[PDB]
Design a protein around this ligand. Structure first.
Ligand SMILES: COc1ccc2sc(N)nc2c1
Lengths: 412, 412
């Protein structure tokens, strides 16, 4: 058999706020974190808006000197991680530090740092490149720096599965604990790809909403007028903990992580299949892993990116998995408010899933003014819906047809 | 309940060969694959050589139409993945495609591609960024593209743990199979960091050998005259397979993967501890994971990067784990010949470890002219050593203090 895993701490930076409760408050009020991107010339760019972290103060976490060495994505991952560990009340000791690990990932990593060091290289040649360029930019440095700052000697790694990173990070952290390689893991993701290369790179694939006139309306998952996703920055981190370890120290337990599913579509590099066959296999994998019948699922935090093919695949996938229960469950995209945090999306959305369980409320899908063809499910258009939620799914479906599903259950 | 895991297929691009057998012939003959770099102008750089993949034809594997969209690290990962799957004899079918996944990782990923697109952005503006910039550069796309081309619908993911990537990728793919999430995994990693930011960034950190006038003598693990690692390019992939599934199809089994350890130093962003304490914990985790008396270990394929601190920390780690038996086992660094393939280091070296078992030979550490203070173990100086090898261990350490160990033994 296998050990049970609970959530005892959460941390977040999002376009809605600099912590979980500020973020969760924006989510339940249907507020948008989307705005024109500042202190950056986007003249030559078809998309000029996104979900920025507003007012981030890294010196609450790090000295100026240590922050100068670290890409914004690492800073964001450290901020959420430190919030999550503080939130958990866990005490690291010589007795337990070998049993505490980290799996904080990113989809794209240090584009901003790569951009500024490129500028240096092209203008002045190699000797102006920072000595901290490599360790200040590579995706495993959130796990590296967190482990060094807190003395964590457990499993130390980083996932990078594009828009699935946060979901896979949390799921595989849960496995480490369940199968006895760790008693505690800090897991989630962080992203800051709102530089030229991010807006440029996604802009050149014409993957992005170009609704520059109304940035807050850009992200409209399942609405007939959606025109691609909104690029957003931030981080989410969860403290995952074995149940007996959490009980022994009197931890506050938000919820239980009961299920993790993975699948590959094996279909296309960036587009999901129209029937969502891959997202369906993955959800079924996640429910089987949790020993749950589809009928027991109450709430789904959808991937719901506001891409035309993505949104419609997820409706197909849900009807396929859930049959006669597909309308009774509530499903919303919090990306309607946050935008797409890419590798961080699954981290912040796992937190919103855990808070849907705590507060017995489905977050809205805002901007769902005119449901598309077949988009007839309970998508919680416009405003939050209080309701019974015992079981909550969080889905992530990313580039390369990589799929993740987390199952959370109320704990008592 | 935990199932056993065997190697049925291996694939490789290295500075010594465009497959495994050609690479292996170089290893046993003590050949260096390090040379001045030709693919760019390095006169302004303090290091001007590396382990380049020579004569790679991507059209053994892909259309030039698909290949053009992909960074070399992805092309290298696919080439190794395809070799390994072919070498396995496995046929993908409707009956098994859900039970075959992929975990191919990278340390840095598509730095070449991100650089070239950055140069386009800076000189010409955002509209010259390739529409293929994101799917062609991000680390999960070896796993993505391989799943699309072979129809693998199993667990689909990528690790990025700097120089530990290949070892972690292989270990956690083995856990997927061990605990029933999959019957087959294609696991390893790929790296092509030999661009301006790579050589520039590692140069700025003073991490690289500057032995430009004798590049084949640069990589000299445990030698008193070593001055940093040699940057090398390539890929390794193994087909990992549940033992009964391998037996059932009459698969040729190269060796059994019995053991996997992880640990974090929690010491420094880039420097290993002088005493090898984190490496020691990681190897001890792996030996206990395999149910082994440490005296059963015959061969260690060291990380052995040719850094002053790295190499000495490893001797200390091995003496501490193995006590007097440290004097009886054979340890070598094939990085003496291949240089440091970073994220792909653990993948190729896991293959060298398996081939060490098949042929009953310890590969040499070339250039070990004057062993340093305390480097007094059997380091297989100069020349391959035929010897009894039942159990082989492959170590990796990386930035963030992240450690991986793999334990293989002969299968009967
Ligand atoms: C069922 O899949 C599993 C089980 C155990 C483990 S330990 C790890 N690192 N990943 C996994 C995945």
């Amino acid at each position: 058999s296998r050990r049970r895993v609970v959530i005892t701490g959460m941390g977040m930076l999002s376009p809605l706020g600099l912590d979980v409760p500020s973020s969760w408050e924006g989510i339940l009020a249907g507020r948008s974190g989307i705005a024109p991107i500042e202190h950056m010339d986007l003249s030559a760019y078809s998309t000029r808006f996104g979900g920025s972290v507003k007012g981030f103060n890294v010196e609450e976490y790090l000295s100026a000197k240590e922050a100068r060495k670290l890409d914004l994505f690492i800073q964001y991952g450290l901020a959420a991680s430190f919030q999550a560990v503080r939130d958990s009340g866990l005490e690291v000791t010589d007795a337990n530090r070998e049993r505490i690990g980290v799996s904080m990932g990113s989809g794209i990593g240090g584009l901003t740092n790569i951009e500024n060091n490129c500028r240096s290289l092209f203008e002045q040649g190699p000797r102006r490149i920072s000595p901290f360029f490599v360790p200040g930019s590579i995706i495993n440095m959130v796990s590296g720096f967190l482990s060094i700052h807190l003395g964590l000697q457990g499993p130390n790694y980083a996932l990078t599965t594009a828009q699935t990173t946060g979901t896979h990070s949390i799921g595989m952290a849960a496995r480490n604990i369940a199968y006895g390689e760790a008693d505690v893991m800090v897991a989630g993701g962080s992203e800051m790809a709102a530089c030229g290369l991010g807006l440029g790179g996604f802009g050149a694939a014409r993957a992005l909403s170009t609704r520059n006139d109304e940035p807050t309306r850009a992200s409209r998952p399942w609405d007939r007028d959606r025109d691609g996703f909104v690029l957003s920055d931030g981080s989410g981190a969860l403290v995952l903990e074995e149940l007996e370890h959490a009980r022994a120290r009197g931890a506050r337990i938000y919820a239980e992580l009961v299920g993790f599913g993975m699948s590959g579509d094996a279909f296309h590099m960036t587009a999901p299949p129209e029937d969502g066959a891959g997202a369906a296999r993955c959800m079924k994998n996640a429910l089987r892993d949790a020993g749950l019948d589809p009928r027991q699922v109450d709430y789904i935090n959808a991937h719901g990116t506001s891409t035309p093919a993505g949104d419609i695949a997820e409706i197909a996938a849900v009807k396929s998995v859930f049959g006669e229960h597909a309308h009774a469950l509530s499903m919303s995209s919090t990306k309607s408010m946050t935008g797409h945090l890419l590798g961080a999306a699954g981290a912040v959305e796992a937190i919103f899933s855990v808070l849907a369980l705590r507060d017995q409320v489905a977050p809205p899908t805002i901007n769902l003014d005119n449901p598309d063809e077949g988009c007839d499910l309970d998508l919680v258009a416009h405003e939050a819906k209080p309701r019974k939620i015992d079981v909550a799914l969080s889905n992530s479906f990313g580039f390369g047809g990589t799929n993740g599903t987390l199952v959370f259950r109320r704990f008592a």
